[PDB]
Amino acid sequence: TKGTSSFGKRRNKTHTLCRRCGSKAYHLQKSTCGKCGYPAKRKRKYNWSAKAKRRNTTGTGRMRHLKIVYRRFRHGFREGTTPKPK
């Protein structure tokens, strides 16, 4: 029966964690993430969902490299030099 009886039979997972983007949208049977499209080189992203775009845009994560790039830009990306020793 379509209601409570059929709810007991759901025990096989369709989706799983995705090694890219870490979301539980990795369709096991299709081997494709429904949020990022992992086997594709390009990230899945659509302009009809601005709310979804800002959930996973740049700046919502850590920006381990970009925050150092912003710091280094203020001094012209200098390398090979040190402050004058005391």
Partner RNA sequence: CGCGACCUCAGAUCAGACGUGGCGACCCGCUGAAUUUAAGCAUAUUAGUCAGCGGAGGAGAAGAAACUAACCAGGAUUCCCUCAGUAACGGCGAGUGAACAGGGAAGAGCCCAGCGCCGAAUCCCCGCCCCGCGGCGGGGCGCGGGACAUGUGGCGUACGG
Partner RNA sequence: CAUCUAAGGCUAAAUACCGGCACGAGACCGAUAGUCAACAAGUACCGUAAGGGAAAGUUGAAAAGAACUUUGAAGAGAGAG
Partner RNA sequence: CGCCGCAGGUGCAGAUCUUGGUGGUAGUAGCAAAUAUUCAAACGAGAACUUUGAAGGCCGAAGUGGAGAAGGGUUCCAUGU
Partner RNA sequence: CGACUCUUAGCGGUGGAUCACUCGGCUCGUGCGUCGAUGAAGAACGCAGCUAGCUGCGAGAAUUAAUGUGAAUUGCAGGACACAUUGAUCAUCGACACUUCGAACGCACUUGCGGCCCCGGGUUCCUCCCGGGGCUACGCCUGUCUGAGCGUCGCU
Chain-centre distance for alpha carbon 80: 34
For the record, the structure tokens of 80 come out as 């090979």
Count of positions on this chain that bind RNA (CB under 7 A)? 62
Least Cβ distance, residue 24 to another protein (angstroms): 5
Chain-centre distance for alpha carbon 81: 36
d(CA 68, CA 66): 5
Task: Examine residue 83 and tell whether it contacts another protein (CB under 8 A).
Answer: no
Q: Which is nearer to Mg ion, 20 or 27 (CB)?
A: 27
Interface contacts to Zn ion, rule CB under 5 A: 18, 20-21, 33, 36, 38
